[PDB]
Each structure stands twice: as C-alpha cells, then as structure tokens.
Amino acid sequence: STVLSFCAFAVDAAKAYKDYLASGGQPITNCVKMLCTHTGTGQAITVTPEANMDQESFGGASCCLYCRCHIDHPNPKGFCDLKGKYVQIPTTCANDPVGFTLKNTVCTVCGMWKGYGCSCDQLREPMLQ
C-alpha cells in the first residue's frame, strides 16, 4: 500500500543509469558477445543469435540492467524479455548494450528495433514482379 507508493517515487534504475551516462560514467561491461555468422534476420530479441552485417549478438541476461543489478523487473509478473534469449545491437552502439536496450523499443509488428531496422513507416514501394 504505502511501500509500493514509496518505491514508485524513489528506486528508479532506468533513470539512474541514463543520468549516470549523462554524467560521463563508464557503461556496464561484461555483456556476453556471441560468435555468429552475421547473416541472420537482424530482429531485436531472438531465441538464437540473429545479428546481420550491421549488428552484434549478446546473451540477453548480460544486457538487462535489471538482471545485472539483481533488482526486480519493471512489470507485475517480473518477467524479463531478454533472459534466455539473444539481443542484436547495432555495431555503432555495441559499446553499451544495456544502455541501448533501455533507450529503445521493439516493433511489435516486424520485431526490429525502432529506428534501427523497422521500416514499417516508410512510403509504399511500387509492386515488383
């Protein structure tokens, strides 16, 4: 009742990390990068590494701020969308996988990251034979 009211105003990992990077703090290290062909689908979160030529595949749990800090996940069930799966991160952002998974969202339609693969908002292509 009053314990959950206090937590929803105090402990906020997402903000504390974004502000920690804003200060200039070193991003979380030891994210587990996997060996893969780099000829995958390029989707955001997958049951197996699916990195394309423009991405790196990492073990999901090692890239989850909540898993890495040993704190509860921000949802009722406490379910993790990364743990047990593989996250594809653009090579240009592979230096901070945790920061990338927090600041971006997965397209519920194509399954690509918003602004890093998802082309659901581009104009309609002329039909091809």
């Binding site: 030891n30 587990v32 060996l35 197996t48 989850c64 047990g84």
Partner: protein, 299 residues
C-alpha cells in the same frame, strides 16, 4: 601439427589410453601464451564454442525436451559466458539448469547458487557439463594426488542422475583431476580428453564420456590414466588457434529426436547397450524436472 589448427581442438589419441605411464610434471612448450580471440569475444565464449563444435562430431543422444545441467557456470565477471554458448548450441526448448558457488546472472531456465554438494534433483539428465575448478588448487599447489572436493559429487551425480545414453564434459587440469572420474569414463561407450585450440597453452582438458552404459565396459586405473593424459600433453604440443571460431554456419546441435524409454534394469540386454552406444536411445523417466539448492540454517 598443421591441420589441427583448423579443428576446434585435439582429442587424446586412443594409443595414449593403453599406456602405463608414471605421473610427472605437465610441462607445455607454450605455457601461458594467449591466442588471438575475435574482437570483443571472451575467452570462455571461445572455449565453450570449441567444446560444442567438437561435441557436434560425437554420437550425443539429443531427445525432444533434452535435459542439460551446467556446473561451474559463474565467473568473477558475474555473468555466464558458457551458459550463453550452451543455450545457443542446444535446440530451443532444451531445459538448461546452471550452478555455481557464487552468485551470477544467467540465460539458463534455472540457476542454483551454492556448493554443488548442496544440489539435489529427483530427475535424470541427458548431458552434464562441468567447468568447476577450486581456486585452492592453484594459489597453493601440493603433491599431485586425486582431488576429492566437487569431483566426489560429480562422480556420484553421474552414477545416480545421468540417464543411460547420456554424456558428460567435465573440466580437468594437471592438478584439478580425480582418479574415480577417470574410472567412470570406463562406464561410457566411448571417452576422451579434449583440449580446445584457444586454450592449448593450458593443461586444461574436458573429460568427455559419450553414451553412459551404467556399468564398466573397461576397468580403468585413474592414477595411470591421468599420467597418460599428462604424457600426451607433454609430448604433443598443440598450436594456439582461434580459426574454428570464424565459421559458425554448422554450430547448432542437430535435434535428432532420440527415443526416451523408462526401461527397468532387468530389460537392459546387449541389444539395448548397442542402441545406447550409437546415441540412438536415452533410458530414464520423463517426470517433471525438479531441482533444489540446500540452505544451511543457523542464527
């Protein structure tokens, strides 16, 4: 030699297993040396990738809903690189449980923290992987005798919780070894000591037992077999190589859908032993997988 550089690693030739060598120091020509790992890849991701690449060439039983348990899955980094590789290698849906003495973040379905001696399970497993290594072994060395810490637990776990047809990959070193574990290799249809090419500068090897028969097909003296292992490492320098890490196209373990049967001990004739030996049969019940970690209660 040369052609070994493109393999994931080197398996102990069978002739070494038939010798009667006296134990002595393991002295590697390239001790300590490091291999060139691909950019941003951890040593244990490379090591487990080569272990799995070699396991792909064996007759592993691979049923649906396969059960794998990984001991010594943690690291000073607080993550589980080996577990991430096992989950990549194993078919999707495979139950993967990992464990370590220290807390860590894992991709396994379940993680148990504490001494492996505190781990219980009423279920049988299809594959047991162990990277356990006692820090005590290194810091303070001593006469190279058989070690009895977590190795006594693994020997017991293999004899009671490994399904017939199941396989194991247990990490050993010059000083981290157990005579009873070598004796148990004689309870598999086949076994070897496998050295990853990325860690060939270390006395480390994985003792691989392929297709558990639940009884000795060969009487093995563990003290002599470890001396044979050291003789092989001392007379066959393995070149450090990361070459096999660059081709991951045939990496995933093929889902063979190996049959699982709950046969009794009185229904294990020579016909069944033959199927277990080719990785065509798993013998255990298929009950709900239940695991636990004992908690020491005190004020």
């Amino acid at each position: 030699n040369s052609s070994q550089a493109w393999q994931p690693g080197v398996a102990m030739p069978n002739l070494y297993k038939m010798q009667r060598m006296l134990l002595e120091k393991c002295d590697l020509q390239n001790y300590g040396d490091s291999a060139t790992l691909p950019k941003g890849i951890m040593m244990n991701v490379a090591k487990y990738t080569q272990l799995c690449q070699y396991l792909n060439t064996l007759t592993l039983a691979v049923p649906y809903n396969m059960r794998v348990i990984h001991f010594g899955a943690g690291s000073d980094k607080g993550v589980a690189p080996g577990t991430a590789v096992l989950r990549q290698w194993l078919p999707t849906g495979t139950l993967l449980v990992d464990s370590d003495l220290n807390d860590f973040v894992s991709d396994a379905d379940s993680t148990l923290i504490g001494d492996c001696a505190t781990v219980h399970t009423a279920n049988k497993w299809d594959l047991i992987i162990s990277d356990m290594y006692d820090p005590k072994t290194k810091n303070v060395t001593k006469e190279n005798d058989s070690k009895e810490g977590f190795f006594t637990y693994i020997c017991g776990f293999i004899q009671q919780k490994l399904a017939l047809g199941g396989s194991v990959a247990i990490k050993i070193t010059e000083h981290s070894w157990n005579a009873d574990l070598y004796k148990l290799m004689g309870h598999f249809a086949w076994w070897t000591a496998f050295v990853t090419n990325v860690n060939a500068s270390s006395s480390e090897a994985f003792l691989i037992g392929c297709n558990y028969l639940g009884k000795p097909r060969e009487q093995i003296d563990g003290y002599v077999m470890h001396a044979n292992y050291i003789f092989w490492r001392n007379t066959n320098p393995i070149q450090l190589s990361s070459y096999s890490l660059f081709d991951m196209s045939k990496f995933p373990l093929k889902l063979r859908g190996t049959a699982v049967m709950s046969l009794k001990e009185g229904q294990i004739n020579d016909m069944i032993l033959s199927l277990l030996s080719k990785g065509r049969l798993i013998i255990r019940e298929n009950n709900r997988v239940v695991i636990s970690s004992d908690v020491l209660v005190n004020n």
